[PDB]
């Protein structure tokens, strides 16, 4: 019952339909990937691969408008955010293209007897399972390091961004990668599970939901494969009493509502000290009234629709649950009276520890503002989570913000900004947010054979 | 159905029996680990931990003979190899106690704007499942890195080394660790699965068989936790035409027959150039006649019994099967006519690619020797294996051995030495031998939060 198709969320219309690859076609795709890997790709020098991967960055920049428009069309992202996605996607590919030689150099080890080094070698085919919320950047985050490492990639995308998926495969074709180096695949869950069992698949990278992560990580475990899991978060956005209030507000608005809050590192739990709570919340109310919500391709649009009826209905559901559980609906909480999946930017307060959404991931334009009485209480609140992806701390006192950062149980903490992407920066969570680090030098370590060669 | 007991492989006598922990006892073990971590262990300084772990190493060395005798008694390791294991176990604990401050110090990141660093923080309770073949070293390998990083440990050892397991628990007690920092546990396979599900267990380290691995890794994946897997090996031991023949025979004998071949990185597949094959085989046949097989508690015994009747019966089975399959029994191939699980050291030749033992892991004192016509044939034969754990290459030409090393598909390659343990040498395999690296700076990084802290 899975359907790969473009259903435009601004217009509610099915634009394009795509067939699943058959068992035979899946076999052909894996056959091709193995062959090119062993016979061609792993044998090319870093410098030859760099040509290709860097050329792909160049193609994305040149054709940024085209690629950003596919993002906006398939899943509704406002064009300025889609164009930003494409720019960072290009940056990520350049980062690995240019840095791979540094990262993939032999690591000689200091030993008092003879010699030892670690040689970095490719593993094989990496199977990547990627989400719809950042359809280019999630692919680049995996494809850039792995192709530079001499791995090949089979990528199964979310069923609602098939054209983005095809555009990324085409990009690599146009950059000069051989057929089989990077391939798209359209599969049901059964076929995906069978692909994980294939002994030629040497690693599984997943970005997505807990549920998806639980099914796939268990499969990878049973097949005794390396895997990485990048899952949801409910990140704390901590605003201390000595925060630059105007700054915290601006970063909170971007953090929660950029991409309509459909971001795993969205500022989902705003944790604001007593002394600046009223002003923060007033700044928040005001800011969401300035959004230009409409057609993601229109000039002045800041926020498009939700990605799908489902994504919208989940957030509206969670909003109404929270209100029935005792929360105050400060703003929003309703679908807009127009065509397409448009939801009002929403603010909730008084969300107690016993409230049904307290521990939920709200993947939509819905702020949750908690009032805390101290620093310690803010840290305690931030940690009262089954998640641990990112986090933000706001304080004019850098050392205080540092101390707070050390005590919040997550994978990443941003100080005086929101959690925001960059190629240089390692990305990943702890607890139910997953394990492993993508991006930075750490990203390229995940799926390689680090071979010890010892002479004595 | 599991029974935790000492059954002395030299006498064949059950010496002591131990009851399973009750679910209530398991509960208290977990509560106490969590409490101790939160309010004590994670909050101690690196230096305070070092004092404890370094004292643990001190006591190991002080009581060398006591601990080594327990290993001998429970699983049959000859005292010189048991003492060596204790010695290296102490050095592992000393290595991480002394080194952790450097290993765990923050990493500055090269960023375009502002600042970023990675800080290294504990995750919580780490569940370790360890084998009988190195009952102390396997525990230190995980307890050392993890305890120093500020994790606490629950350890389930193989059911035939319970006195070793309890002694290692007692060692950290005597060293001043709080109760709950390191704990032994006696569990059946069902309770073990239930412990993996517990949200408080933040990672699973297993060294064991493929089938143990498959079940536990599936469980850890399904519970959304990081697992670490060190499974089978069937390592190549490559002797080229220009090898120092005496040196290669010496290391082959130790590689295959140390701990009676009950070693995941044992030299299981000896691959010898046709020009030196006869003199190599001659040097091997001769060397094995000089073993002193007997009571492992004696300091002049070189080889004790197998660890169990079943480990012994299987190795003898694989031999009979190999000969029925067309192999030549050069030497050994029988149970010794005395009390205990004593097997003769065995050499097999003419094990062809269609012989049923060709891809099998032989976990016993059974050398398999392959003749090859060339360096490339040797590389090809080494790579004709579902495993990729360790490996060795012997050649006076070091450049040539380095090129062969590069070409063998394995996690580690030793030149002119057999695969052998050292604290500063990273350890792991590829293919069906599992994944991840322990020991060195890499071992301490498996179960930590690599937290990004970023000031924009």
């Amino acid at each position: 019952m899975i359907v790969y198709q473009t259903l435009n969320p601004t217009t509610e219309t099915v634009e394009r339909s795509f067939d699943l690859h058959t068992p035979a076609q899946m076999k052909d795709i894996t056959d091709r990937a193995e062959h090119v890997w062993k016979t061609d790709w792993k044998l090319r020098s870093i410098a030859q691969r760099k040509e290709i991967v860097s050329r792909a960055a160049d193609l994305l920049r040149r054709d940024r408008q085209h690629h950003a428009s596919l993002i906006a069309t398939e899943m509704g992202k406002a064009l300025p955010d889609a164009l930003e996605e494409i720019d960072v996607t290009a940056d990520i590919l350049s980062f690995y293209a240019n840095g791979a030689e540094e990262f993939l150099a032999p690591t000689p080890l200091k030993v008092k007897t003879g010699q030892a080094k670690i040689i970095n070698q490719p593993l094989g085919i990496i199977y990547c399972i990627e989400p719809w919320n950042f359809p280019y950047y999630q692919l680049a985050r995996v494809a850039g390091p792995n192709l530079m490492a001499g791995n090949v990639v089979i990528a199964k995308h979310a069923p609602n961004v098939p054209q983005c998926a095809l555009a990324f495969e085409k990009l690599f074709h146009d950059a000069g990668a051989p057929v089989g180096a990077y391939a798209n695949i359209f599969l049901d869950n059964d076929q995906s599970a069978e692909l994980i069992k294939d002994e030629r698949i040497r690693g599984v990278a997943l970005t997505g939901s807990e549920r998806a992560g639980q099914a796939v990580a268990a499969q990878a475990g049973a097949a005794l494969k390396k895997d990485t899991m990048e899952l949801g978060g409910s990140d704390a956005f901590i605003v201390l009493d000595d925060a630059d209030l105007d700054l915290a507000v601006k970063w909170a608005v971007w953090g929660r509502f950029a991409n309509n809050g459909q971001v795993c590192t969205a500022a989902k739990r705003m944790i604001v000290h007593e002394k600046v709570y009223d002003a923060f919340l007033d700044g928040l109310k005001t800011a969401i009234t300035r959004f230009r919500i409409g057609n993601p391709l229109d000039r002045d649009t800041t926020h498009g629709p939700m990605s799908s009826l489902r994504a919208m209905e989940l957030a509206l559901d969670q909003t109404a649950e929270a209100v029935k559980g005792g929360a105050t609906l400060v703003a929003g909480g309703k679908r807009m009276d127009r065509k397409g999946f448009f939801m009002e930017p929403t603010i909730l307060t008084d969300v107690s520890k016993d409230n049904p959404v307290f521990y939920q991931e709200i993947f939509g334009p819905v702020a949750v503002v908690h009032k805390v009485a101290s620093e310690q209480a803010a840290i305690d609140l931030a940690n009262d989570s089954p998640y641990g992806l990112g986090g933000a701390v706001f304080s004019r006192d850098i050392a205080r913000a540092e101390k707070v950062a050390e005590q919040v149980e997550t994978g990443m903490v941003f100080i005086n900004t929101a959690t925001a992407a960059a190629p240089e920066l390692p990305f990943g969570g702890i607890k139910n947010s997953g394990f492993g680090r993508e991006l930075s030098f750490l990203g390229i370590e995940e799926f390689i054979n680090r071979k010890l060669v010892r002479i004595g």
Side-chain angles (χ1 to χ4, degrees), chain A residues 394-416:
Chain A
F394 288 72
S395 172
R396 278 163 199 287
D397 179 356
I398 301 310
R400 190 177 180 211
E402 175 67 60
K403 186 174 206 163
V404 173
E406 301 183 327
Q407 298 185 79
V408 176
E409 304 181 286
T410 28
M412 318 168 280
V413 184
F414 287 63
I415 297 170
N416 293 326

Side-chain angles (χ1 to χ4, degrees), chain A residues 57-69 83 86 136 170-171 174:
Chain A
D58 289 341
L59 299 172
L60 281 168
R61 302 199 175 94
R62 181 192 68 184
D63 306 335
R64 63 195 297 269
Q65 301 289 164
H66 165 84
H67 292 112
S69 301
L83 286 167
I86 299 297
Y136 279 61
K170 187 178 180 293
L171 173 77
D174 292 351

Side-chain angles (χ1 to χ4, degrees), chain A residues 10 76 78-79 292-299 301 303-305 338-339 342:
Chain A
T10 296
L79 225 221
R292 298 176 302 281
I293 296 143
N295 301 342
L297 302 174
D298 280 359
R299 202 203 202 204
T301 298
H303 298 78
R338 58 163 296 171
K339 261 271 168 171
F342 292 86

Side-chain angles (χ1 to χ4, degrees), chain A residues 190-428:
Chain A
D190 287 355
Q191 298 178 286
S192 191
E194 285 313 286
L195 189 55
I196 293 152
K197 289 183 203 181
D198 190 302
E199 78 179 354
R200 288 162 307 173
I201 305 304
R202 301 305 324 149
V204 190
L206 176 133
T207 313
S209 76
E210 256 199 77
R211 182 159 299 148
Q214 299 178 79
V216 173
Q219 284 156 18
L224 298 167
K225 270 145 211 214
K226 330 210 188 200
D227 64 23
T228 45
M229 300 291 131
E230 308 265 353
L231 277 13
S234 191
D235 294 352
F237 188 90
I238 292 166
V239 185
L240 264 19
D241 58 344
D242 65 356
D244 178 340
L245 254 169
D246 294 325
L247 186 66
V249 166
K250 285 171 194 200
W251 274 119
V253 167
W254 182 86
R256 172 76 279 206
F257 297 98
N259 199 15
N260 287 330
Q262 297 163 128
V263 187
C264 297
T265 56
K268 303 192 178 88
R269 290 170 318 125
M270 294 171 190
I271 298 179
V272 183
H273 191 293
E274 277 187 344
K275 285 168 53 191
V276 295
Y277 176 85
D278 288 337
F280 178 91
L281 176 67
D282 184 284
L284 186 58
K285 288 196 209 155
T286 306
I288 68 160
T289 69
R290 289 157 180 153
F291 295 176
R292 298 176 302 281
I293 296 143
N295 301 342
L297 302 174
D298 280 359
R299 202 203 202 204
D300 307 330
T301 298
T302 61
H303 298 78
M306 302 292 285
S307 57
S308 65
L309 178 69
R310 175 160 195 272
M312 186 190 189
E313 286 200 315
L314 292 178
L316 293 172
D317 183 34
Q318 286 168 314
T319 298
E321 294 179 63
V323 181
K324 302 184 182 128
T328 313
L329 178 58
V330 173
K334 285 132 225 182
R335 175 164 194 181
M336 294 166 58
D337 179 38
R338 58 163 296 171
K339 261 271 168 171
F341 316 118
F342 292 86
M343 182 180 172
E344 292 165 342
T346 306
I347 302 166
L348 288 163
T349 54
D350 308 292
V351 174
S352 85
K353 196 201 160 89
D354 300 312
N355 190 296
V357 311
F358 185 77
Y359 292 127
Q360 294 187 43
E361 180 174 22
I362 313 177
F363 217 60
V366 180
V368 172
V369 200
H370 301 278
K371 191 187 74 172
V372 297
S374 63
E375 186 178 298
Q376 197 49 66
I379 290 165
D380 282 355
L381 185 43
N383 291 348
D384 196 1
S385 190
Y387 298 104
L389 188 51
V393 184
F394 288 72
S395 172
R396 278 163 199 287
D397 179 356
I398 301 310
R400 190 177 180 211
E402 175 67 60
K403 186 174 206 163
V404 173
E406 301 183 327
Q407 298 185 79
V408 176
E409 304 181 286
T410 28
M412 318 168 280
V413 184
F414 287 63
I415 297 170
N416 293 326
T417 46
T419 304
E424 298 75 27
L425 303 173
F427 177 102

